């Protein structure tokens, strides 16, 4: 339906295009993404019960991609599986947990066996020191912290009766909050990307990745793992038909048109890498 | 991953190099597609309890994409049924692809098209074939309503020509009623091609039923993954091609094998695929 493959060969002249009469095309690609999605349902997360577990108010994920823990509305969790480059449930898109619900995130993480966490922005739903916490019927404890410039990696052991899980936690923490992203916010993210990515082709199940509302830094996030992995072994680019993909799994993932414009911006950044490097195939 | 998309105007130039050296790359192709899916479980359908409940012990259902039957405080695995939910050219879950339902199984195939809330069933099979069994005659045979389980069926209305048949169905279970479209294509072999202008033309007729209809659409042959595979791949690109000017086979076949195991078959049906695609771009090219 939404979908403008672009060979690589044309991506300068295509975003320079995209860019033209005030990012015309950029604003109408936008405005037909927000399109994506409104037919379908989202009514557990309407549920009475269940309204006091999301964060923004329409900010809903859809019934049938929802993520299910496993009382009246006890399976419920703001979160989707979301495709990726490898499976079709290889993300899970979610909020930020609230005070409310970082009972129930520990239980996803646990019962989803991810062992992957990437935390999108700066609600402390962790160990603050090295004591072990009983979230729930689950105890966590840090086992260790590294901290870089731009974000934070810590490892987790979570226990529950005689199952026991270890999971990586990858926070970024340079996210621009104003303003244009510069060549080195681009730059720092797509090694923050790659990072992750060396982790996760050694991992079960699938990468948890939130921000606050589970949608805008978190879809981009998704769209660019993808988009290094595809670049790296084709030679065109379906962003477009990416970003609609991932508005059928979750709402509004790319919150806004300066995400998605940022997302091309990335892309061309890697279209550049990808000529320099002039890498036969492995 | 596996992904190839084609500009229209060179698809003719594209299918004769893939058919080079006795279709060459075709075949490169389809050994690379034969890979997709291998690492998704699908511990359901390995369950003893639903052994008798699988047509064939290896066209088994993924469990992240299976369908599941709803039942109150049922028996253990009451929630199986080889299916699985196929992305569509308009939605997520818009396709169910099933295998032919087994005389074990009818009861369970009419509650899932009662509780999906399917109104369209596609059924590219005979139940049988050279007087092999291929698939259950689920249905009724007059007019008479039947009673599968606690869900009644009513053939309305039967209209039976040369390469398909077209059944009205009304079925309930107490007061939810529903009506249900039923195409039989009866001209495509198992494990073979139609042998493209009958197949289209099904293909469009039972389009012109979906714009009209809601629900997913309920997809099956005999396996439920070579002919309701290609099919499934013919339906969405008919609607691609009317869309847009390029096509990817390849990424359209690896996606559908990520939700169901070994949808298109054979290289012959992915090869017919190709020659479908070529025959809806000369159409489109009469406007």
Same mark, same amino acid.
């Given at each position: 339906?939404?979908?403008?493959?672009?060979?690589?060969?044309?991506?300068?002249?295509?975003?320079?295009?995209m860019?033209?009469?005030?990012?015309?095309?950029?604003?109408?690609?936008?405005?037909?993404?927000?399109?994506?999605?409104?037919?379908?349902?989202? =009514?557990?997360?309407?549920?009475?019960?269940?309204?006091?577990?999301?964060?923004?108010?329409?900010?809903?994920?859809?019934?049938?991609?929802?993520?299910?823990?496993? #009382? @009246?509305?006890?399976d %419920?969790?703001?979160?989707? %599986?979301?495709?990726?480059?490898?499976?079709?449930? #290889?993300?899970?898109?979610?909020?930020?947990?609230?005070?409310?619900?970082?009972?129930?995130?520990?239980?996803?993480?646990?019962?989803?066996?991810?062992?992957?966490?990437?935390?999108?922005?700066?609600?402390?739903?962790?160990? =603050?020191?090295?004591?072990?916490?009983?979230?729930?019927?689950?105890?966590?404890?840090?086992?260790?912290? #590294?901290?870089?410039?731009?974000?934070?990696?810590?490892?987790?052991?979570?226990? %529950?009766?005689? #199952?026991?899980?270890?999971?990586?936690?990858?926070?970024?923490?340079?996210?621009?909050? !104003?303003?244009?992203?510069?060549?080195?916010?681009?730059?720092?993210?797509?090694?923050?990307?790659?990072?992750?990515?060396?982790?996760?082709?050694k991992?079960?199940?699938?990468?948890?990745? !939130?921000?606050?509302?589970?949608?805008g830094? &978190?879809? &981009?996030?998704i769209?660019?793992?993808?988009?290094?992995?595809?670049?790296?072994?084709?030679?065109?680019?379906?962003?477009?038909?990416?970003?609609?993909?991932?508005?059928?799994?979750?709402?509004?993932?790319?919150?806004? @048109?300066?995400? %998605?414009?940022?997302?091309?911006?990335?892309?061309?950044?890697?279209?550049?890498?990808?000529?320099?490097?002039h890498?036969?195939?492995?």
């Amino acid at each position: 339906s939404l979908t403008n493959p672009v060979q690589l060969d044309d991506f300068d002249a295509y975003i320079k295009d995209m860019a033209k009469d005030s990012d015309y095309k950029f604003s109408l690609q936008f405005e037909e993404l927000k399109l994506i999605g409104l037919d379908i349902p989202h =009514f557990a997360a309407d549920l009475p019960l269940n309204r006091c577990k999301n964060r923004y108010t329409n900010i809903l994920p859809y019934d049938f991609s929802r993520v299910r823990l496993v #009382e @009246e509305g006890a399976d %419920y969790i703001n979160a989707n %599986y979301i495709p990726g480059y490898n499976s079709p449930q #290889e993300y899970i898109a979610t909020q930020g947990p609230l005070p409310e619900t970082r009972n129930d995130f520990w239980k996803m993480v646990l019962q989803q066996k991810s062992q992957i966490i990437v935390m999108l922005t700066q609600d402390h739903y962790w160990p =603050f020191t090295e004591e072990p916490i009983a979230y729930g019927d689950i105890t966590v404890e840090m086992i260790s912290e #590294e901290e870089q410039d731009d974000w934070a990696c810590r490892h987790f052991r979570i226990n %529950y009766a005689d #199952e026991m899980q270890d999971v990586m936690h990858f926070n970024y923490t340079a996210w621009p909050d !104003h303003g244009v992203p510069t060549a080195n916010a681009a730059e720092s993210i797509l090694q923050f990307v790659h990072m992750v990515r060396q982790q996760a082709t050694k991992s079960k199940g699938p990468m948890i990745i !939130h921000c606050s509302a589970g949608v805008g830094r &978190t879809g &981009t996030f998704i769209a660019l793992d993808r988009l290094l992995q595809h670049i790296r072994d084709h030679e065109f680019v379906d962003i477009l038909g990416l970003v609609s993909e991932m508005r059928s799994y979750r709402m509004s993932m790319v919150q806004t @048109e300066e995400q %998605y414009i940022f997302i091309h911006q990335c892309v061309q950044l890697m279209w550049m890498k990808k000529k320099e490097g002039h890498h036969h195939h492995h």
